[PDB]
Design a protein around this ligand. Sequence first.
Ligand code: K0W
Ligand code: IHP
Length: 1751
Amino acid sequence: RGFVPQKEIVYNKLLPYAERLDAESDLQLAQIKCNLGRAVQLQELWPGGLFWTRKLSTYIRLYGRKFSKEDHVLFIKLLYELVSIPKLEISMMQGFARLLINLLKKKELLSRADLELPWRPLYDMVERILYSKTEHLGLNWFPNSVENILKTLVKSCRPYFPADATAEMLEEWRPLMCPFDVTMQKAITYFEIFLPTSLPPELHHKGFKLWFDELIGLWVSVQNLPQWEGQLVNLFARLATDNIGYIDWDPYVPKIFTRILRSLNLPVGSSQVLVPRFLTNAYDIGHAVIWITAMMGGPSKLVQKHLAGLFNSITSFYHPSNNGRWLNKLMKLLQRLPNSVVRRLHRERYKKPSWLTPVPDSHKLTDQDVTDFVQCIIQPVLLAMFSKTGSLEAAQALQNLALMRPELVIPPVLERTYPALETLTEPHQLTATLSCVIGVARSLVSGGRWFPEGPTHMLPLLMRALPGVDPNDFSKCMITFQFIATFSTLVPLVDCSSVLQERNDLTEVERELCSATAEFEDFVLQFMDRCFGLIESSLESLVELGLSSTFSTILTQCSKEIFMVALQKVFNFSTSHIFETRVAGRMVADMCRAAVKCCPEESLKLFVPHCCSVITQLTMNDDVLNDEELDKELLWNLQLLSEITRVDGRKLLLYREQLVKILQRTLHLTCKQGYTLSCNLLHHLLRSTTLIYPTEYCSVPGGFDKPPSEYFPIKDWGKPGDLWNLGIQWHVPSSEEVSFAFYLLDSFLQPELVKLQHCGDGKLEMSRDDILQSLTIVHNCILGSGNLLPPLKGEPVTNLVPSMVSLEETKLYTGLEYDLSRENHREVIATVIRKLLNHILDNSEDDTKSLFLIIKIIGDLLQFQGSHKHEFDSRWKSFNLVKKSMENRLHGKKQHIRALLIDRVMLQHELRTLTVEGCEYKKIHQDMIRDLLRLSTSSYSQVRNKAQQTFFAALGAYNFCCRDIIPLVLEFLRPDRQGVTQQQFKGALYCLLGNHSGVCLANLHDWDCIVQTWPAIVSSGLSQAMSLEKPSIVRLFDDLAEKIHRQYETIGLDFTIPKSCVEIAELLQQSKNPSINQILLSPEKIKEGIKRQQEKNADALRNYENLVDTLLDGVEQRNLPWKFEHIGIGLLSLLLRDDRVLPLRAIRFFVENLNHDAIVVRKMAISAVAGILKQLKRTHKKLTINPCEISGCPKPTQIIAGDRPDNHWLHYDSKTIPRTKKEWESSCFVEKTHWGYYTWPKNMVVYAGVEEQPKLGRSREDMTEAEQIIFDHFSDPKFVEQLITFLSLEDRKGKDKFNPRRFCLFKGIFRNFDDAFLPVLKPHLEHLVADSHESTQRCVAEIIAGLIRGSKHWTFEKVEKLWELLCPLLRTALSNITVETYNDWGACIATSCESRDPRKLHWLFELLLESPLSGEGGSFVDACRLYVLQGGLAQQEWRVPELLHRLLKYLEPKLTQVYKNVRERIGSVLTYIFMIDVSLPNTTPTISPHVPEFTARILEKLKPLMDVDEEIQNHVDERTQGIKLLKTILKWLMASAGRSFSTAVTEQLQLLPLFFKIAPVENDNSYDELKRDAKLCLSLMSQGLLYPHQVPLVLQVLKQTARSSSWHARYTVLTYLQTMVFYNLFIFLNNEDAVKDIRWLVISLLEDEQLEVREMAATTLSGLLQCNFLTMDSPMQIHFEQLCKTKLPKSAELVKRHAGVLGLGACVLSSPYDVPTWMPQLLMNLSAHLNDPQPIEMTVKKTLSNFRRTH
Ligand SMILES: O=P(O)(O)O[C@H]1[C@H](OP(=O)(O)O)[C@@H](OP(=O)(O)O)[C@H](OP(=O)(O)OP(=O)(O)O)[C@H](OP(=O)(O)OP(=O)(O)O)[C@@H]1OP(=O)(O)O
Ligand SMILES: O=P(O)(O)O[C@H]1[C@H](OP(=O)(O)O)[C@@H](OP(=O)(O)O)[C@H](OP(=O)(O)O)[C@@H](OP(=O)(O)O)[C@H]1OP(=O)(O)O
């Protein structure tokens, strides 16, 4: 046609009316182009621009793309330039972004030659919304799902960025890469979001080869778990997948795999624990799996060797006995890894050539490369089949592993399935080995040309699973139903066993597989007695969904020969075994309609004459009409006929006459089991006759009951997909059955509609049980015949919204062609039920049953067109669960069982008939929602609750109708509307609360609906039909105020579409592939558009400043309870703008109630006034320095990090602080603590001098008149004494903190006024540091912090006057520090010098590093003043090298001289002293203290402890002070283990052999606080990453101190090696000399003189041999067996036999849950050493007991 579609939805072509969808969707696309290009040009963003955005979205939910490549680009460019507007409302930016994700989601449709989206407006967009500077002060209020929808919005646009973007993302975030602060996190989040990885290989040199070596050297050089390196592995996983025949990963793979194994955080060793170690994040296996599977392949498998080694290391932990907290993530590795290999194989093989860069032939997965993956991973998968958590994530692994290698996967799972389904003592296995045969099923039934036996296992295993259909287990009867249903769609069970005339053309498998087909009667009848007994003895509405699901699945897959036997067996059981009508007859009648739904013409012939005759014989007496019990043979046959008839309606027009006659008599029969079972008979009779649905659902198209059985149905087991030759048998309603539906509606709806219309009059005094009956008939008649009768129409409601483009409904066809010459039957029913609602709600108020049906009939007159929304939702959910469990992912043409592939076209039809867009609100619908409200606010709470759910669904159905009813919900909660009721008020505010996932009506988006609602919701506190004494009314106003504060998004006040969005929108309304011929836009109304928009964002301003004023008028209204003013202030606290300053009266309000008598309002006021002082801040001017213009040096290239010469002037040096006003005014003062560490930015800001800054010290006449209010309050003593009285008061005793909310209050005070308030404050905070209270010291710490941070932009005279004040204040405050107080001054000082220049606040450091370790106050103030100082030197990282040298020079004389609580602080402080000496790549050696230089001076001092003769542990010269030193440095290494970037440097390694001989052996019990201190330090230090150059050095240390004379030392080096290998194990496995050194070390220590170290060496040999780090050699057996034969000595002799026996025991204990081939001969050798004397006897006995307890 006129344009080329671009990946349509396939399922639109398969509809019965698919000829109509071409002419329809071309018109809708033309309207979307026209009224989106108009709407952006017009800047009608709210009613028109966001409308046709929302209608373009539902054009893609319905039709796929179906627009040109030329026109796809136009939508992308328009909604990209329009989603990135620098001050655009974030609330409606959500819709533009969600469409823009949806337009770039399928990446293969554009090609970078069609689209070149810039990256800068996305970065300015994320900075505004992820690193917002005003959200924490409460001025912005984003939606909650924003970060997750913008990180995918940038992810969507990222493959289309310009080629130069990487190089200009690396000059803008590379300056932020200082690893010591929080701005490294910002850099690596922006790299993980923005930095492009999918570029063609023609320009890899402008992509990842411009940052990769840098960023992965940065990745490898750290050993912590920073929160940014998990951001960084998310980045390399994306890089590895997109570029696979490229970056080698070969130097890196032994580090990726070993960090993944560390992330699995398996407990290894003799109870060595890691409380300190990072357990929380950084290694999701979703991305680690992706990164593993993208590295394997190519010429060097290396990656497959590591992957096999990984699963050899974890094989103990996948065993079902060994479950733990690790298992939730080890199951994730196992379920996600074969899936991602399936997706790689599909990417490489069965995915078509496209724009995306294809994988090279050199790096595709080969035959052996994927066979080796199956061979490595399957034993943990089979081991995890029997897991206690529930076998779900092993079945998915078995599904994906059987797509690639079914011959390696299926025979083990049925080797474990046939015994499991045979047993009766292990029932955990049946649920395991049947759920794991569900996923293996499509591979099992196919064969696959190398596993042909496959299917022959089907019908044996299908028959043997029949006792699972069980009344006793719900749990196995579910999986048995779900097993029989999945192994019967996969087989046409036509009896193809009468083929012995077919001497050739068959296989020896196919012959044996067709002469087993004859047992298909013996399956569908033995199955069916299992299903009869379960009914006869019948959580249970699922075992009739499963029952009727698998029985309908069976019965469409059986031939007409099998079906007649099943039909006779259904019929005799339903006919002669009379059933109760609640649970058992509900099951039989749904088993009956499976047989009726299959072959409609023969099965219906049995039931409908029988059930009509048996109902006719039992209804004959004519006193059964007014009998209110109905003897229960009529109930069952009436239920049977009721559900027998939801079938193909064309095949039921034969039984037309004598089925209306069964409705002529039973509908008016007074028993609500029996007109209900006869009106749902009427329901299922209409909707079988009216609605469009497929009829067959078979696996083989359009046939399957065919007389020639000479061809061969059992070579078709599978046949997946075939979308094109599909052949859906649709039931489209013919004119005959539409005529039957209207006759059945004119015979059973019209009389009782006349009856209810008279009942609305003064005729027909009608019973309440008779009104309910007639409404029940009307409800089921509408609810069946919905598709025929067209929806409600009428005149449009008038005064809602000016609408310059258009507001048009979507007209979707759905295949029926409404008869408009008949009287619409929705309108007459609405006419009757409105008048009957007036009758009931005025005459019979208490009719709690019919009234509900007025609610349901309003709810379906207004909504229901043939399809239920909830049923379609349930079906959709079911579809993805069935689709994912049968997903042949490897193959890529939507191959699926024809059953769910027909069900998906039916879902496309239901999605099509169910989505009706923003249709005109049309005053007949207004009366539906007026009258509904009358039910929403009614006498009974249950009719209110059910009435509000159809009310909330009525409001999301009509555009601009939430705004229509705002003042009618709000009538009842007016203060002056006299006497509404208690229940009308409670109903109006439930109505105004909404529900969890719909409209709210109290927090709608416009101004015109908040300015109404919020003053009503505060002013409903003085209402006199209002009672807070009721505990539900308090709960709802707390829910109302709680929901709005949770869901307010900032609104509007500016909408101005720029001259870039209108430029690209003119081209979209003039594109001519598809169009309606619409006129060029007149500039007369490109002037009325600006005219309407400028006055539309003018009453946004009017409504905002009106809302603030009337919240203020309401919150102080002469008698209002404290709840409502606490509500009305929090709602007012939501209105701190940042586009404007707050209203003058609200500034007055929040300032005057800082000192309010309620502490809740005081905290709201602290937050609000901090927001006010941020709104009122004067902008400080910046200049640009060249950083080689103050330093005077060439600022070299080849970018190097760390302390440089151009960096050096920015360091704190004690000889260059200004000290005068002239050296201060001529100085640079780079404030941030990261600028210039890594590199300098393109331009760099300075904060220029005071002569150009905003002038400070104003005299209140120069102030901006809202500074007047804060000045006139914060400068008088009375306000300040009340403020500091309320603000030094204890709130939560023991739970109070520093509270940075109150710090932001005083930081803004001393940032806007700065000079006059502290003379008012100096007596108050002079008094406040002298108090030995807790909360008074809290109060002054917040004021001192905000006063120090506030003095950032002051004059030298004014900061000089500030520090003459603050120095004695801080001296007194740190001398009077307390246990209740110390971590509050630690937050005061760390807060007061974060993001500040250290030279500017040098008075802190001279006060606070003078004597932290002094002695007055004793201990604990030495520890806490050295802690308060610690946060101060911690915030000023890398930039204060000396003063960290001054602290090291101060405090090396004091490591010996100090108490227990202080050397912990000494250790944490030395950790923060040596943070800056990093081994990070290309980092210049720091000016900061070096950690090797210090620990050499320690090694000098600690020398007399580590010498010969081994006497240690006295702690009572240069030896006891060495013990005292070793205490302090042991607490240092404690804190250094998890914090420093390069843990355990090469001179923090000679500290080990001295720590080995002093650590204990067995227990963690109380040993001198120096042994247990050395035990946990050793346990905490093996558990830590090593470098590859470092694993020779540590192992050289270990074999040195395993050769010592201390057996405690030789024990603990052998536990150290035990934890040190498995944590970061590969690093050692990527060293052929380290594995040999470790095996020589463990074999050597296995023959020591101490028995304990021999047992420990056996334990660690057995553990290193278990994880396969160490291989059990043939020389290893020779050495052990030649030690076993030593002699009895007639020791030096018995120790050798014990060594050899102990090594053999290590070898047989290394395989706990498996006997390998070498074990039986090896275990006979240990049997010859039982009577071998002690200690060999105990080793043999413990070894063999430990053997056979696990085998
Ligand atoms: O309509 P649904 O239910 O939301 O699900 C859609 C998905 O959502 P979307 O249409 O974008 O909203 C979309 O997947 P993503 O875009 O997220 O990747 C399609 O993938 P695509 O076809 O582009 O990708 P490929 O073909 O798998 O390579 C379809 O996934 P497959 O079945 O794997 O694809 P097949 O339809 O079988 O061809 C799937 O069609 P179904 O309706 O049958 O589930
Ligand atoms: O002094 P700090 O506590 O470090 O806070 C500053 C300060 O913001 P406030 O004055 O609102 O606290 C800067 O404002 P000026 O003093 O330079 O006017 C602001 O810079 P911008 O106003 O240019 O945003 C900067 O924010 P940023 O670091 O994003 O530039 C921000 O630092 P924090 O982000 O650490 O608060």
